[PDB]
Design a protein around this ligand. Sequence first.
Ligand SMILES: Cc1c(-c2cc3ccccc3n2Cc2ccc(F)cc2)nc2cc(C(=O)N3CCC[C@@H](N)C3)ccn12
Ligand SMILES: Cc1c(-c2cc3ccccc3n2Cc2ccc(F)cc2)nc2cc(C(=O)N3CCC[C@@H](N)C3)ccn12
Lengths: 588, 588
Amino acid sequence: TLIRVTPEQPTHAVCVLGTLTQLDICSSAPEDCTSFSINASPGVVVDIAHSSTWPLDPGVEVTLTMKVASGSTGDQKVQISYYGPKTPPVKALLYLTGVEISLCADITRTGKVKDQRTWTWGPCGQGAILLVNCDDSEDLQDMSLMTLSTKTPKDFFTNHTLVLHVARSEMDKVRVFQATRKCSVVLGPKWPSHYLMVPGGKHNMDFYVEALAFPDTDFPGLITLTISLLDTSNLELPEAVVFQDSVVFRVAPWIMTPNTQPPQEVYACSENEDFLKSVTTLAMKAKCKLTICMQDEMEIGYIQAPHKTLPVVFDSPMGPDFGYVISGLDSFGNLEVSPPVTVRGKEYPLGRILFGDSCYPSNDSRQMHQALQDFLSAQQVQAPVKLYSDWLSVGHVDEFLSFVPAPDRKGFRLLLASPRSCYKLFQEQQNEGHGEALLFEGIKKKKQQKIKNILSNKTLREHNSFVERCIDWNRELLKRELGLAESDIIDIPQLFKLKEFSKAEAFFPNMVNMLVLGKHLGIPKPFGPVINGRCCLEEKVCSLLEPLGLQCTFINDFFTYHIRHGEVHCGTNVRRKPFSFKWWNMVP
Amino acid sequence: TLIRVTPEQPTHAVCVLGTLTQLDICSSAPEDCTSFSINASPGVVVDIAHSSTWPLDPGVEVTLTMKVASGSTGDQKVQISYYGPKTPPVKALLYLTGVEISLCADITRTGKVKDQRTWTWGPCGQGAILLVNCDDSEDLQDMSLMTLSTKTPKDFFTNHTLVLHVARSEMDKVRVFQATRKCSVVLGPKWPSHYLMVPGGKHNMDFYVEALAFPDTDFPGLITLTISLLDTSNLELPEAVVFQDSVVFRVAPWIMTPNTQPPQEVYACSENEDFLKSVTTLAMKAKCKLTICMQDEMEIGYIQAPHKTLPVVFDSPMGPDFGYVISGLDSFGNLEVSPPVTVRGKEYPLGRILFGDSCYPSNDSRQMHQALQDFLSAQQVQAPVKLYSDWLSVGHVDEFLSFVPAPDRKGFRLLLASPRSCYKLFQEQQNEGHGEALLFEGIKKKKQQKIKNILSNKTLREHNSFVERCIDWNRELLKRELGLAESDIIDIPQLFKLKEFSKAEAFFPNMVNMLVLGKHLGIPKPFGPVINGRCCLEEKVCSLLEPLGLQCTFINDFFTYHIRHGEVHCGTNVRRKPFSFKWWNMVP
Ligand SMILES: Cc1c(-c2cc3ccccc3n2Cc2ccc(F)cc2)nc2cc(C(=O)N3CCC[C@@H](N)C3)ccn12
Ligand SMILES: Cc1c(-c2cc3ccccc3n2Cc2ccc(F)cc2)nc2cc(C(=O)N3CCC[C@@H](N)C3)ccn12
């Protein structure tokens, strides 16, 4: 893309509109002559940087611009006169053929097709987004548009030829279809390059692009597609590259919705009892859709481009929504996301994903499978945070933490399970004489217990006092990585037993692990000591939550054992409104 | 690491120096009382943020600091008085044991052991560097020092215990030895955690750390080592984490030395003839060491930490230096690095690595193995640049480009092979009547050729005219990615034949692919047409280079065919001075 002119022969060149072209005016000059000048046909725009006159100084820098594409091979002309003290002007002729080759996608991020060949984050960055095909004129409504607009002479592709191509390293992560009034595969796995059939004149060409893989440990998540122009005139010699333009795509990451995000649909596909009633009552009250046909073993996120926002469900290691993609800590039981937070400056507008882990890796210690941890980080926009959960028998963060919408402060509360909270309440009672009150009243199969005989236990007080620490550790972890003050955290009274290998389960139905449908909470009925005909525990949950403006509804049968994989399981799940904020306008 | 005080019992806590500790003054308070005050023993430093008085407002934020470590369990005391309108002061006692746990490496990057747990690039970033063990009290001179300084009561580790640990994801990329006046493996592959034997009082402990893997596609190149403090007092319950500190290490990348870098040793281990003489003459003249015992199939780089700079030789897919680590484009023939460049602002002080590739991937097209391309990028500091070389039969960038030191401008010249340069010279001659001059004079086995009969060839003029394009394409690629002006580029006259499958070899010994020893150039003797007893070609090389102050010495037998892997091969190699500039002070 530098042109060398000889006064010997006339040189012919092609010129893509929008390309600074340098002129070697010097290499083949006569030394009889000292200086030169540059006349050109009206449609060409010479810019000499150091009528007119100039010295033959090799330091001078003549550049060519073409205004409009040619209608004819060589219909624009550049003449170099080489004159000097007494050595008449020698001419050197350049016949230019201008052509428009512009390859475009939605780099502006506005659902209309319009910088560098680099993808930039944020409100003023450039880069088209690609959604993952998660298994025409309706299928193409998910795929991203990319058009090749070309103006050239009728004759042009007689001895020129375009080829679209993708790095053999990215071909298996993209598929490209060429539209035809009706589509066909040009690029994808096993095909990294394609020769285009393009006619002369003004022809624009529509391609539809889907991604095949999410970002991950082996894919930073960019697919560059390049158009190359090739000279095929010398018939015996191989193709000569004249020109390359490209578009960088960024594959949209998988994003999760916190409980603070308004609900859109509740899934209760889970046997059943009067639970389904108390759910449909809270679903009606929540002005939210309810369905029936496990929920604990999968998580409904979304993927988002300017042109489409689609719900995608990630299934933990089937007729629900539309879009799908071993340790006890590999479950999505062990996967929450915070609400939008800011932390010491850095901003996290789609929140931060939280997942349970150990403190340090021993031979008696469990972690989430590295493969998952890396995948979540790959998505970048929800900077995962590693919490301590291995102390629990099951090992899930949803066992001791939750979020609920608040009106004031940061517009949310962190709910942490709290043995102390429950103890201070249980004894405050003994002091008022209700020490005789029986926890587990109205229960088919459970040995009932009095406040007194629970408080008077020394073995329990410690077990719970140890759990206090385990949570109080995550309390700080959360306070730091989500940038929280105590005035953002609410302690829900909750006790624990330590079963096999000193591991922890909730002592009574785990009230923190609730159903948030905006301001309408489905809390697991603790079935606790009743005092003056009101479950002491229900009272304190409602006293900590109703002030926030949250409708607390305690539901029986909230969890359930099963036969195979035998495990306690929540039966509900909630598709929620995707963030207004566009993932591609943040800055990791 | 929040402490809750009850007026019921006295609470005991440990406190690591340098840790803001929060006091829950409120959860277990009496409601008979309205306000509180905080007296403490001289060595503790309370900071109440909202003698003294304060309201019991849960919004208040009492924080604990300890000055010096304790000599005795609980030798520092905090008392919380809860007083009110007519409700005498109730006390709540806190017995604090202060301890120093500080884990340190060379985070300052100064070869002395002294922010966050994050590695930062540049002149004011923090992060210790780790060199790769590339196969005592001399072995440890390569390894990085990390010390655990602890001051505690004599009694302290009776019911506390430290453990050093590395993410199971990074254990196979690090090895950690514990010194003993004498060393042993604490952490590495198959061991992610270690219990430390630490005594009470002031004890500091030396660990030596080596990396086992360079950064690569599956390793961003950081090794975090964490120290955890564990409470082992409750004997029946599991260990409780009280405290964690960590050091992030960055594994030093493999770096290459351009020709602009002063030579330190020449390797001519390569049979031989009078070549070895003409080399030792240029080596003596270059005040540079020469050795004898292939050079084309490996590349001497370096790895660099504050405490050690070591030469490492990367071997392309043996008794030379010290430190080691299929397509025709996988060779290091196809691997140069530019000199230090700046490009449109962005700065590249260790230069940029250049490697040959195709334009677009066809079924008749060769690329460097993705595995290598990714490795070079992994090292980050020399942002690889992809050039067009597949047009050449062998396919190596060193076939058409080189660099040499200059005094002025950017302190270097890009040397590009140039058919035009050679043609303008070859004909300028015919014009002066030496058209009869025979190229390949004094050659045992080669059919000689006259300027006239080379110029009068139409088949050659084109072949060479096609190569011109191929290079003129890299000319622009180089001009853009290395940010160059024509006044940085020198054209060396060089012609080509196109052998099998229209591929290119040098028509005469490839003069651009020379031996740079600072200002002393070993150029391959072109064996070209002699005019007035001086090889026309030698004249023009020297006319383009001697002005720069470069001593041009044309060497016979510079390349050589072999038996197995039968291929043309340069026999020399050059270990060069590593950059003064520290890779860890740049910013990718
Ligand atoms: C022992 C236990 C309890 C609980 C303690 C208890 C005591 C008596 C009666 C019911 C009791 N119940 C209710 C229940 C219901 C039916 C049944 F057969 C088993 C458990 N409540 C929870 C909640 C959780 C929790 O939060 N998770 C469930 C596991 C998967 C995690 N992802 C989420 C974990 C353990 N729990
Ligand atoms: C055909 C050729 C020539 C050349 C052309 C030529 C013509 C006549 C005589 C000698 C000639 N010679 C000299 C030579 C020497 C001995 C021998 F048996 C083969 C080639 N000179 C080069 C230099 C290069 C080059 O730059 N490379 C070598 C390959 C590996 C690359 N990494 C670097 C490549 C091909 N060449």
